[PDB]
Design a protein around this ligand. Structure first.
Ligand SMILES: [Mg+2]
Ligand SMILES: [Mg+2]
Ligand SMILES: [Mg+2]
Ligand SMILES: [Mg+2]
Ligand SMILES: [Mg+2]
Ligand SMILES: [Mg+2]
Ligand SMILES: [Mg+2]
Ligand SMILES: [Mg+2]
Lengths: 276, 282
């Protein structure tokens, strides 16, 4: 059973969320299997950011067991701004564990592959949900290949009706257009340029997505075994894979206990709707 | 100074918000002056629903001092559903006190009776409001919604404290600084009850937002209707509780009514059923 352990108050520099298996911390990057059911291509998604929130929370590559923490820029907490007509993030936003976009192999981010989960229920930070892949988009975020897998929680009431990317157009009309717009404009309020998509913004289909996911997983297989070119930056401690160099069961025990803190308030500025 | 007095937990049937002046409840409907500054057409807006929320909180016409209470549908809490690409209400949403959309007359602009409520206000500024807030706003324009067949004007307004307020003086300025907001507003009020099994609404003037001058005229009309109502001179007061603590010349004046309200019993927000998360694609 997967739960979460929260250190500190939400919306602070000290905030951290660890994933626990049966009460013990494990690595959110390395220890959650990519597949919940490999035969039927059911994936485990680590959720970072709930739909309709702003705080830019991410699995941290550089800290032990890769807790989810808030991104910062020059010491200041990062929040995505509200870009009309959107409110914060428009998907449950996360990553697949045991994936790595190797920045030495080419057509690369050095991060796990990103996942947009489009189901009805709002997710929680640190949630491990089981999803099926529907398709994939290729954003060029600031000079780099930034895949966005489109997926759905298998528990969603619509899940059996969605198998491939065309089903998103059918049941969620306008969501793909919104996704294109969102990723184009979301950093404009931060003073950054409009982003661009490859494939003229087309969402490639499920087969294409599975190909990309499998290839980011193989790379990761060699990261954690230690045979990769350069795991610089990235911390590779894990506690579930007994025959890896960086297996360190003690890492679990070194994590502080759950702090019991109410969410810190968020600056009223974050309310603002930007018309861009 | 206006403050709020909260009874119970938000998102429960027991929740109530009274508006207070001097730490004592007054009627949210009758005792808050429509005008903060008559000469400059600055209005007091009572906020019911913060932007990007769902709970359908309303001034309660039938309850003494007219606290804000969550509306119910056959005894269950009412939440407006998320209509793609919107999240909850896309405005800070409320009303002008001391107004009444007269249900006892047909309104010539829409050829329909009035909705039986204070006139509704959409406040478009950047800061998310709170339930029971009294804020000062300038009117910019107005739209004529036919909400299930009734005249349901929507005033377009902005908080005078908004950074943009000095640059927003008439309805054209909304399109300039908030491009798309008016078109989205038209869409929102057309579709927002479709997830409840109701039909699409329609607007008069093909959804045109009339200007500030037009808006001030309609607001005046609803203030005049309220004056008749609160004097006991309406042809049908619709079971509205007219109790008030500030209007001595009215038959339902009673400074004492304020004392009979229980003390604040604020509890943490109750959870909302996960169904309310759902995004509807219409
Ligand atoms: Mg990042
Ligand atoms: Mg990512
Ligand atoms: Mg990126
Ligand atoms: Mg990425
Ligand atoms: Mg109503
Ligand atoms: Mg109303
Ligand atoms: Mg209405
Ligand atoms: Mg109304």
């Amino acid at each position: 059973t997967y739960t979460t352990r929260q250190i500190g108050a939400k919306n602070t520099l000290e905030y951290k969320v660890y994933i626990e298996k049966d009460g013990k911390p494990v690595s959110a990057f390395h220890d959650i299997p990519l597949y919940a059911d490999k035969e039927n291509n059911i994936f485990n998604m680590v959720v970072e950011i709930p739909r309709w929130t702003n705080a830019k929370l991410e699995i941290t590559k550089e800290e032990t067991l890769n807790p989810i923490i808030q991104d910062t820029k020059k010491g200041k907490l990062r929040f995505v701004r509200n870009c009309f007509p959107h409110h914060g993030y428009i998907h449950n936003y996360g990553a697949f564990p045991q994936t790595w976009e190797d920045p030495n192999v080419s057509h690369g981010e050095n991060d796990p592959i990103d996942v947009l989960e489009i189901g009805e229920t709002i997710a929680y930070t640190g949630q491990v949900k089981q999803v099926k892949a529907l398709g994939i988009m290729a954003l060029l975020d600031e000079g780099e290949t930034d895949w966005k897998v489109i997926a759905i929680d298998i528990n969603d009431p619509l899940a059996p009706k969605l198998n491939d990317i065309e089903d998103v157009e059918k049941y969620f009309p306008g969501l793909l257009r919104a996704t294109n717009e969102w990723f184009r404009i979301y950093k404009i309020p931060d003073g950054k340029p409009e982003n661009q998509f490859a494939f003229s913004g087309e969402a490639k289909n499920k087969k294409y997505a599975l190909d990309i996911i499998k290839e980011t997983h193989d790379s990761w297989k060699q990261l954690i075994a230690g045979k990769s070119s350069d795991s610089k930056g990235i911390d590779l401690t894990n506690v579930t894979l007994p025959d890896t160099p960086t297996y360190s069961k003690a890492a679990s025990d070194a994590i502080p206990p759950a702090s019991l803190k109410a969410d810190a308030p968020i600056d009223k500025s974050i309310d603002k709707w930007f018309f861009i």
